[PDB]
Amino acid sequence: AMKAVCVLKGDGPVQGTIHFEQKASGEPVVLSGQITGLTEGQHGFHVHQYGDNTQGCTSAGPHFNPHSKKHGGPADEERHVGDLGNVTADKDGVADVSIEDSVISLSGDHCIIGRTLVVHEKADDLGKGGNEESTKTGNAGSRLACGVIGIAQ
Amino acid sequence: AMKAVCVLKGDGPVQGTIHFEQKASGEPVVLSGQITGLTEGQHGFHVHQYGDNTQGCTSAGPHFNPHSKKHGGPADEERHVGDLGNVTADKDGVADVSIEDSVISLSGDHCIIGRTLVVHEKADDLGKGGNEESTKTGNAGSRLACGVIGIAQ
Ligand SMILES: [Zn+2]
Ligand SMILES: [Zn+2]
Fold it and tell me: Where are the domains of chain B?
């Protein structure tokens, strides 16, 4: 079994911890955790390409995209590998997270270990925003907090 | 060619940025970068097993030690994989790190991507202190700053 963990923080009040679990090579990855300090509602949630936070979140690069595809939702076949959709904050700004994904991995070609998890300012539109950016970025806006995904026990 | 980067933050005055470069699977990792806010002199400089910073640097675990050896210097024959030795700070509290190591790696069984780099409070005795502690951590003391090692462009 593989485990991973990520501590997210940024320039403001958003912070949280995300755990990844993957029973075997060909199993889905389960994320779970909590993020606090968010505006109420939905926020984009992506694995970005680099585990480089020398410039805070901006140095993480684009969404993790080995196959040079377009941005989509987690349920689309046409998606960046990093496209995990949205995460949902309550009225008190708390986002419990619980997600299963079979495209990211903790080993092999789609390994996200050593890369960066980012929570975003705006909802990810899942490729349906009808402008150029939706296709790149889901229009999710600024990177509110991030962390390098590391190996967990 | 492989590249990696690590931003070291702590709860105290110590911070830094470390860059890693390996030319191919067989070759040494070259480390450069800088750390500031240190007391003048030597400090343990180790890659610990887990990239987990949920409770600060302490949740990173012990030194990366796949082969279950006791602690040593990088040049000793019995050493942990994560055993990089000492890093030296000048009178102004700056360590201009430059290190070449052929035991760590940016891929494979000795891969340190997704693990935690820690700069320690005291000098590493290189496993020769003749006490229990020497044998594990080199009597390097507390964890001054740390970061998960991440994939870089
Ligand atoms: Zn995307
Ligand atoms: Zn050691």
Answer: 1-153
